[PDB]
């Protein structure tokens, strides 16, 4: 099975989102559930992103102000600005990290049902707005090739 891109369908992106969120929550000891080198590379890339981010900025959750009524709009506003002038793998990693932060903060703030919603919002945004860019730019395979190496 080497003729086509790894994780080349929306169903695969969904799995990718669910595994990512499960991991981000597990790092905080919160248990939740709803391509293998792809999941591994994204874990690594997001962790390395977070490390760099935190060197320069305060905790990402310090500027969120989550409520159940405003969470979807907060998500959409942030992500729409993130990709307003374009897409690249670094911004896609930023997208996963932001979604993970939304989920962690939801559980922290005793709004844990929002996790399931955030996972759906991420999956939909990925499939509606990032997936065709991903296919046009070498698939998750290209991402693995570029971000596979540490740092």
């Amino acid at each position: 099975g080497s003729m086509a891109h790894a994780g080349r369908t929306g169903y695969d992106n969904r799995e990718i989102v669910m595994k990512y969120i499960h991991y981000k929550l597990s790092q905080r000891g919160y248990e939740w559930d709803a391509s293998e080198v792809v999941h591994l590379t994204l874990r690594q890339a997001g962790d390395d992103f977070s490390r760099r981010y935190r060197r320069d900025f305060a905790e990402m959750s310090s500027q969120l102000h989550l409520t159940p009524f405003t969470a979807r709009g907060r998500f959409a506003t942030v992500v729409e600005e993130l990709f307003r002038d374009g897409v690249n793998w670094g911004r896609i990693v930023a997208f996963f990290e932001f979604g993970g932060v939304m989920c962690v903060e939801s559980v922290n703030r005793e709004m844990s049902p929002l996790v399931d919603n955030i996972a759906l919002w991420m999956t939909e945004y990925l499939n509606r707005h990032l997936h065709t860019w991903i296919q046009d730019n070498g698939g998750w395979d290209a991402f693995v090739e570029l971000y596979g190496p540490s740092m």
Binding site: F57, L82, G90, R91, F95
Partner: peptide, 21 residues
């Protein structure tokens, strides 16, 4: 705060992009 958050995500994202290449 939301605008600033997005900008922080975007630039850190762009940095990462550039380092990979």
């Amino acid at each position: 705060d939301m605008e600033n958050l997005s900008r922080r995500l975007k630039v850190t994202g762009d940095l990462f992009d550039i380092m990979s290449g």
